[PDB]
Amino acid sequence: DAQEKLELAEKKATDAEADVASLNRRIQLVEEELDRAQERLATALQKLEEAEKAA
Amino acid sequence: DAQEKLELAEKKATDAEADVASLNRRIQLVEEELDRAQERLATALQKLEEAEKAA
Amino acid sequence: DEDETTALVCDNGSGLVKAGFAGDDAPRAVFPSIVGRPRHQGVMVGMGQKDSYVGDEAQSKRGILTLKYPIEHGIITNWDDMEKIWHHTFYNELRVAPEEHPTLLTEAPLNPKANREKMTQIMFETFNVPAMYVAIQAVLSLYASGRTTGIVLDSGDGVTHNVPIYEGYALPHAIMRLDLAGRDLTDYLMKILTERGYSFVTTAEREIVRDIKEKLCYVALDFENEMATAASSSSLEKSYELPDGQVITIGNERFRCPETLFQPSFIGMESAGIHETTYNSIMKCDIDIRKDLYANNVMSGGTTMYPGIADRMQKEITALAPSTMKIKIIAPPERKYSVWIGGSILASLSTFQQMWITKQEYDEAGPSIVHRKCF
Amino acid sequence: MQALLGARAKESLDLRAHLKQVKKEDTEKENREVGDWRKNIDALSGMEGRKKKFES
Numbered sequence: 001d002a003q004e005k006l007e008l009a010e011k012k013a014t015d016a017e018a019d020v021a022s023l024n025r026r027i028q029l030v031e032e033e034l035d036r037a038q039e040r041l042a043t044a045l046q047k048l049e050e051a052e053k054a055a
Numbered sequence: 056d057a058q059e060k061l062e063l064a065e066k067k068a069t070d071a072e073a074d075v076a077s078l079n080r081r082i083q084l085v086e087e088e089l090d091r092a093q094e095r096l097a098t099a100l101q102k103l104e105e106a107e108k109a110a
Numbered sequence: 111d112e113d114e115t116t117a118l119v120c121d122n123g124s125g126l127v128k129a130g131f132a133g134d135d136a137p138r139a140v141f142p143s144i145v146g147r148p149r150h151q152g153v154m155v156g157m158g159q160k161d162s163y164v165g166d167e168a169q170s171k172r173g174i175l176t177l178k179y180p181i182e183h184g185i186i187t188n189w190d191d192m193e194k195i196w197h198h199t200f201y202n203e204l205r206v207a208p209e210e211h212p213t214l215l216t217e218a219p220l221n222p223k224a225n226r227e228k229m230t231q232i233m234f235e236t237f238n239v240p241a242m243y244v245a246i247q248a249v250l251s252l253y254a255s256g257r258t259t260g261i262v263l264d265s266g267d268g269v270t271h272n273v274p275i276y277e278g279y280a281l282p283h284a285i286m287r288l289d290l291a292g293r294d295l296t297d298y299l300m301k302i303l304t305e306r307g308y309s310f311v312t313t314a315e316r317e318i319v320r321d322i323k324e325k326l327c328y329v330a331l332d333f334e335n336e337m338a339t340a341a342s343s344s345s346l347e348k349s350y351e352l353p354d355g356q357v358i359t360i361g362n363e364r365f366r367c368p369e370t371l372f373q374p375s376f377i378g379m380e381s382a383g384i385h386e387t388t389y390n391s392i393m394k395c396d397i398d399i400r401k402d403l404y405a406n407n408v409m410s411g412g413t414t415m416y417p418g419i420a421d422r423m424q425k426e427i428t429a430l431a432p433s434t435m436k437i438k439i440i441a442p443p444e445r446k447y448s449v450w451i452g453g454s455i456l457a458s459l460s461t462f463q464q465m466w467i468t469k470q471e472y473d474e475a476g477p478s479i480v481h482r483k484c485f
Numbered sequence: 486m487q488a489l490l491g492a493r494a495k496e497s498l499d500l501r502a503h504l505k506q507v508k509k510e511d512t513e514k515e516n517r518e519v520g521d522w523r524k525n526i527d528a529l530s531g532m533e534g535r536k537k538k539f540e541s
């Protein structure tokens with residue numbers, strides 16, 4: 001029972017960790033898309049400056 | 056050892072789950088920031104289109 | 111399912127395939143012109159795994175696939191693979207079966223006849239499209255640009271077309287179709303990077319080089335001054351991240367590869383380059399039509415995104431051109447996508463609804479009808 | 486004496502306005518494919534244990 005609870009707790013940890021990792025992958029994918037959105041925003045804003053400058 | 060590993064596996068599971076929860080928050084926060092960044096990007100680009108159009 | 115039975119529009123190049131519906135300002139999706147096939151023996155069972163992959167599937171699963179391109183220098187050489195691409199492009203991704211919508215495809219005006227005939231045949235016989243019309247790519251570039259007069263130089267992956275159009279009319283005796291294109295620039299870059307110590311020969315390696323080109327390369331309006339420094343100092347090099355974490359830097363090679371559009375001898379081609387062909391498309395037209403073509407050099411297609419290409423294409427023409435005359439390059443944001451956009455514009459014109467081959471006329475005449483009805 | 490410069494400047498403007506109006510009418514009439522999509526994620530927050538497969 002300690003061992004089964006352990007396999008279950010270890011599984012919970014494995015799955016929770018699988019999700020710590022899946023979440024970190026999504027966080028980094030989203031943070032990267034965010035940083036990229038912000039890089040692309042800074043670019044869009046710089047290109048906006050070029051467009052307004054063009055205006 | 057099974058019981059100690061259980062307390063530690065459950066702790067690890069708790070910590071891993073706590074990390075999933077902290078990370079679920081990091082996702083919701085970054086996810087929303089990305090949707091917002093995409094909107095900011097779209098906004099800068101729409102302004103670019105209007106500024107370029109003005110040009 | 112759609113609000114109206116407007117045409118589906120799809121520009122099938124040697125590089126990319128793009129599609130969406132007539133009336134919008136963008137394709138819904140872009141795919142590489144690829145059908146992929148496993149080059150390895152499978153060992154695990156119940157792994158899914160297709161016998162062949164199409165478009166983005168082929169590129170996404172490329173780690174174990176050999177990837178083939180059905181289109182070369184503007185024409186389809188493998189129609190079976192294009193059939194797979196069109197099914198995926200129109201039905202799996204735009205979610206519209208061609209059976210219920212007219213389809214507008216495209217080809218250059220001096221594109222070999224077999225290709226405009228095969229596109230007409232497949233959409234009518236395998237997709238049962240109710241109507242067809244294969245667009246002139248130069249026309250679509252002009253529609254997207256908002257021009258009726260100019261030289262359309264479409265520098266795509268396949269072929270550079272170089273066609274003078276005046277007031278909506280072609281001047282065919284002055285078309286300089288040239289077998290110099292973006293695909294050659296990619297292979298040249300694989301070879302020059304090999305010289306730098308970063309060999310590229312396989313499909314995965316070619317896709318990396320195409321990605322390097324698309325993010326790092328440029329033309330340089332004044333390449334002699336640019337290479338004098340770029341070939342002398344690391345301050346002109348730019349780093350690229352490869353899929354496995356490796357970093358490659360490129361110096362004068364960064365613009366020397368695109369330079370081939372002006373210097374075709376770099377790839378063993380006998381040609382004057384794109385600026386001289388623009389010049390001759392203008393110069394071979396009557397003098398009352400050149401004064402408008404000089405002022406309207408119309409840039410279209412891909413490769414047009416390299417910084418310095420517009421200025422490099424205007425400076426060289428100006429140098430070849432007579433003095434007094436104003437030489438002007440038109441290089442809109444609707445670049446690379448201008449043919450698709452023009453396709454949407456053509457498809458929605460009320461006057462264009464009389465230009466369609468119906469799936470009646472098609473069967474009575476056969477696919478040769480494309481030359482009676484389209485161009 | 487100025488009748489022709491008026492007419493010629495106008496002809497140029499009418500053609501340019503026509504050509505731009507044609508591409509602008511499609512730009513404004515339909516605009517969905519020119520936009521973007523959510524592109525959401527899985528996360529698997531409901532994964533409280535192992536699956537029924539022999540592989541899990």
Ligand SMILES: Nc1ncnc2c1ncn2[C@@H]1O[C@H](COP(=O)(O)OP(=O)(O)O)[C@@H](O)[C@H]1O
Pocket residue numbers: 121122123124125126127128264265266267268292293320323324325410411412413414415416446447449
């Ligand atoms: N960022 C970029 N920089 C330089 N060249 C580009 C870029 N994007 C696209 N091109 C190039 O343009 C070519 C695509 O040809 P294209 O004109 O789009 O055919 P099509 O008319 O069917 O759309 C490819 O060789 C591609 O590498």
